[PDB]
Design a protein around this nucleic acid. Structure first.
Lengths: 114, 209, 120, 56, 121
RNA sequence: AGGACCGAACCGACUAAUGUUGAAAAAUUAGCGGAUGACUUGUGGCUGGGGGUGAAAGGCCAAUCAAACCGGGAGAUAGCU
RNA sequence: ACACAGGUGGUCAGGUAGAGAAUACCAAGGCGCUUGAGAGAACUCGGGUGAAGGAACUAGGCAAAAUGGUGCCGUAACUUC
RNA sequence: AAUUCCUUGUCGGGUAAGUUCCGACCUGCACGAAUGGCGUAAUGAUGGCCAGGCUGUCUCCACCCGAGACUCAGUGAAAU
RNA sequence: CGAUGUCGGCUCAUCACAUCCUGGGGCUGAAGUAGGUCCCAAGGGUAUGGCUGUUCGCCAUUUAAAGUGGUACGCGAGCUGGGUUUAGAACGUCGUGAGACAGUUCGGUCCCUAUCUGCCGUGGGCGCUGGAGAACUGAGGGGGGCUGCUCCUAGUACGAGAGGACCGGAGUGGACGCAUCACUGGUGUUCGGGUUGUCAUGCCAAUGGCACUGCCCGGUAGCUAAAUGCGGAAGAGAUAAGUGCUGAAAGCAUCUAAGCACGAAACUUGCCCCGAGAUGAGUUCUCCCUGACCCUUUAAGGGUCCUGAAGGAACGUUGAAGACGACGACGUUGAUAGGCCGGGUGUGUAAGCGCAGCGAUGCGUUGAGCUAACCGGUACUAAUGAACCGUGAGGCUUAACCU
């Protein structure tokens, strides 16, 4: 609509980096415990939706202590403060759910457009 | 207190600075125009009749055109009326309407529900289906017993059966306002609100508040 | 129930609907005027007009696409050579429906559907 | 699933009250040729309002 | 998350797989989140530990496949539910070492002392 | 080699659903058992009702069986409706 | 009883994939099943797919879901070998 | 116990929990030796119990694909 | 007895109070906490499994609580068919035997297209007194009515200690209900892709058909819970049990005889929905019609000419409206639907060519082609001008005002 997304244009971040599914991106997120707050890191292979606008999602998968953890992120949230590319990966699919259940199998790296 | 009338636009999220991400229903409110003021001498109740919209002036009939032309003119999409208790209002239109919802904290939203039509017992009420497998010839989703044998001999009036679900006024109470903005001409309320998109809503300051 | 859903089932399954609209689009492109039942004609125009718009810009890939749907080389040639070169100055609206009386066997609201620029 | 008593001819006619057909009440003469046709329809002389849209 | 749900055990003394047999609290409480205390029976057990197969006792969940929804709209989901064994009388953990990631939603009362032993919060 | 194994035609009929004024007066669908044998099938013949035939269930003997059908004694008898 | 989703003996037997007369698409050949047209409610029939749990359902794992080929490795209590 | 009325006998196993199952004891209401007793590999669309895999059986239902139901034109029954 | 289907379970309930919880009180051998017993109160709430066909009962683990009873021991033209209660077969017992048992064991066909009442939803006619468009008042009627844990007050009162409050506030849950799709997800046989067998498009290439959508991998709009917002109170009036003030009959006493004052989730309201067929048919605001005659009983009409108003309807394009009606948007003074253009979204680098490699295949062009129901515009197509219904100033009697 015209009138919706005028309220969203001010809300979306203009600093979101370019990503594709298959990359091993790293997300720094604000964690508060008391009055004090701290950045926590999270790095893993992404299974990201393409943006639906202000509403957006980056499902990032990482096996940390032997248990697989998949945590989605609103891309335009104030809780997420920095997303970094790190590795650049190449896959054919858009969603890597079939490539999430196997253990110790990693997406490859391609130099360009990935 | 009088409650202004609006049109549903959609739902959006507003991220707070903390990051709480509350849902928001955007209710577009044009400037309400008071058409007729009712007082105890003309009829024993107090109210203002309010129009909102812009009709095409080919679909307006002459009886509505004369009533619009009386007491300050603006063609509108319809007429509504809100009862009033403690104040006094003019017979002309008001200029900006959302600024009286500006100071308030909790609103009360009324609108028509979406038409689910002829819906059965399991969809209309929270009924249970009968079992899917162990026998059950032709009786999975069906209503069960509608009565109590011969001593009543009849079916009671409150008996829940299949019928129309939807297209009724449903009112959500104590809804919390997020913001107002006269220049964007909007009223933003947290969470779910009755209505299809493009349906007219009656937001009032909350009776429980 | 259905809300903001489009497409007419026409009391058919999906394979038969696609085959019908392939044959019906082919017959309309060939003869430039066919007689149909009314909802068949409405869905037929929703099928026919994208193929004519696809025929407006000629390339090998567009001909391969318009052979993938409507699956006949003569209709492909007729479209890409003389139906769309005529509608090049026209932006949409390549079809016109004229309601008629009801058919004699069953009361079906019957309607011609014709191309706006007819060769005949 | 059967009746216990026979419905009367009054009750049958009372039920048959609502299904009586309606006349169309309006026939539009076409502009180009003076043919009474149903509204938004071909006059079966080949004509819509403007012209002879179908040869047949 | 439900009656007759097998869960793994995230601590050392609690052993192998447990099945949870009642979701505690509530009149008809169908579901257990992350913070919620459940009643388990021990279906499988290692030989060494203090628990044994076939005893009733309490547990707190720590991980779910459904996961837990943060206020921003995000959800953190795991592959495999898990529970941390707690004593029946006092609800403190039996085990010494907590294994695997444990979420942030159990910052209340004894689950803080679970958090201190947890590797990743 | 095999009253051997898996499995189609063929014979059968354990389960569920649909039908129950049916598509069908015993069936359709999805599975199911036997499948070189005490198998299955075509044509013809024989056994006739206190009789036949029965790997035996009161089973079968023309949609009928603890006694077939058709005609006769016959308008049996009915302290019952 | 019927222009009836049932029953009826024998013969021939093309291709590709396949052990095959299974099965999938097809040659020769024959059909579209003697009411159609709309719309796309509850409810019923036949199917498809489901977050988390996995028989907690129930008289009962009834129904569904699963499993399935070829080659090789490997294979227990018991036994009339 | 295909046989036990008392009887859900008592003890043990399995389960968080077991009138069914399995192993025992023998107080056999009212087993028992070709009216056959006890055991038994293989077999069974056989009865009872348990485990794994699997799942809409279920918690708790949601959507979708078709055939009716609904509307129109034609023909047009039934028990009562 | 020319037929009233039998235990239990599933689905759905409704009622009584002889009340399980929650609400209020009296006594207590009631210190507190927790009880015991009795009175008032029916507003809401009142587990999940193991065993067994079981009702019941035992057992596990919950809960504030896991109430008692009526309704053909509620409900089989709503379901099941385990139990019982047909025909087969067997055990123990009885009988010489045919057979038999409230014994025991394996197997065993549950039909119906709703006429009337009754409910659940929707229309058509007429009425309401001239005819239309809306907006309301509220006689009524329905829905809702549950509650745990923690923290403060407060380790206060009480209590030797142990322990541990009344009243009043504040959060956070459990079941229930309404709404909605911004999020998390499901479905998404109408979008994209991968791939097997075969057939065709003359063959390579590229595609289409069929095999459940052939099998899968994702997924738009819509529908949706498992997701997300909100909600059952605050507060009034009159009370039940109770507790009272003043006060006599009866110089005292006494809550009562007079007068007065508190008191519960019960009653009447307060909240949400229907609602003037509320025939007692209500109110307010606006719009529209004020011409000629003829005959006739003249408790009054009928007919003819002229004119058809406001508005409704019919038809078409349609809808987050819908079984059909209905309701809502639009009809060229036009964005009502299809197409078109632009974006978005979803797949994931189309086709064509060229390069590399023996070839399978890879690379460049290139986040490329295709894109649904999405969003913003745009008259290209279909919404024809007529035509139809509805008229011509709206009865009598009485009372007030003007004349």
């Amino acid at each position: 609509s015209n009138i919706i997304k005028q309220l969203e244009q001010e809300q979306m971040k203009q600093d979101v980096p370019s990503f594709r599914p298959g990359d091993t991106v790293e997300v720094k997120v604000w964690v508060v415990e008391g009055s004090k707050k701290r950045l926590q890191a999270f790095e893993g292979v992404v299974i990201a939706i393409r943006n639906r606008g202000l509403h957006s999602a980056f499902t990032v998968r990482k096996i940390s202590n032997g248990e697989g953890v998949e945590r989605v992120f609103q891309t335009h949230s104030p809780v997420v403060d920095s997303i970094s590319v790190k590795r650049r990966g190449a896959v054919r699919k858009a969603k890597l759910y079939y490539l999430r259940e196997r253990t110790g199998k990693a997406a490859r790296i391609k130099e360009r457009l990935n | 207190m009088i409650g202004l009338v609006g049109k549903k636009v959609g739902m959006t999220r507003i991220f707070t600075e903390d990051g709480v991400s509350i849902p928001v229903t955007v209710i577009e409110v044009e400037a309400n125009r008071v058409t007729q003021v009712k007082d105890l001498a003309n009829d024993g109740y107090r109210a203002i009749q309010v129009t909102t919209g812009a009709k095409k002036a080919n679909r307006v009939t002459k009886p509505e055109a004369g009533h619009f032309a009386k007491a300050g003119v603006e063609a509108g999409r319809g007429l509504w009326e809100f009862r009033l208790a403690e104040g006094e209002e003019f017979t002309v239109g008001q200029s900006i309407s959302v600024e009286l919802f500006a100071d308030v904290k909790k609103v009360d939203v009324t609108g028509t529900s979406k038409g689910k039509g002829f819906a059965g017992t399991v969809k209309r009420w929270n009924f249970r289906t009968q079992d899917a497998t162990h026998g059950n010839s032709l009786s999975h989703r069906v209503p069960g017993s509608i009565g109590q044998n011969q001593t009543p001999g009849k079916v009671f009036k409150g008996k829940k059966m299949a019928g129309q679900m939807g297209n009724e006024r449903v009112t959500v109470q104590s809804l919390d306002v997020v913001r107002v903005d006269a220049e964007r001409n909007l009223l933003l309320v947290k969470g779910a609100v009755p209505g299809a998109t493009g349906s007219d809503l009656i937001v009032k300051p909350a009776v429980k508040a | 129930m259905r809300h903001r859903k489009s497409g007419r089932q026409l009391n058919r399954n999906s394979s038969h609907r696609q085959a019908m609209f392939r044959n019906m689009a082919g017959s309309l492109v060939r003869h430039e005027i066919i007689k149909t039942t009314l909802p068949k004609a409405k869905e037929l125009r929703r099928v026919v007009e994208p193929l004519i718009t696809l025929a407006k810009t000629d390339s090998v890939a567009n001909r391969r696409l318009a052979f993938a749907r409507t699956r006949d080389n003569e209709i492909v040639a007729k479209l890409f050579n003389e139906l769309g070169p005529r509608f090049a100055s026209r932006a949409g609206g390549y079809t016109r429906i004229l309601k008629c009386g009801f058919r004699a066997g069953d009361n079906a609201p019957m309607a011609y559907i014709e191309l706006v620029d007819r060769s005949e | 699933a059967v009746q216990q008593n026979k419905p009367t001819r009054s009750k049958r006619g009372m039920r048959r009250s609502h299904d009586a057909l309606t006349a169309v009440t309006s026939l539009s003469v076409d502009k180009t040729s003076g043919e009474k046709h149903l509204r938004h329809h071909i006059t079966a002389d080949g004509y819509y309002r403007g012209r002879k849209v179908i040869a047949k | 998350i439900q009656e007759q749900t097998m869960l793994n055990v995230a601590d050392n003394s609690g052993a192998r797989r447990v099945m949870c047999i009642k979701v505690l609290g509530g009149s008809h409480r169908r579901y257990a989140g992350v913070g919620d205390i459940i009643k388990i029976t021990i279906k499988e057990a290692i030989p060494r530990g203090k628990v044994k197969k076939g005893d009733v006792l309490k547990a707190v969940v720590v991980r779910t496949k459904k996961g837990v929804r943060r206020p921003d709209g995000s959800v953190i989901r795991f592959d495999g539910n898990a529970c941390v064994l707690l004593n029946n009388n006092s609800e403190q953990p039996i085990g010494t070492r907590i294994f695997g990631p444990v979420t942030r939603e159990l910052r209340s009362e004894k689950f803080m002392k679970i958090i201190s032993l947890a590797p990743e919060v």
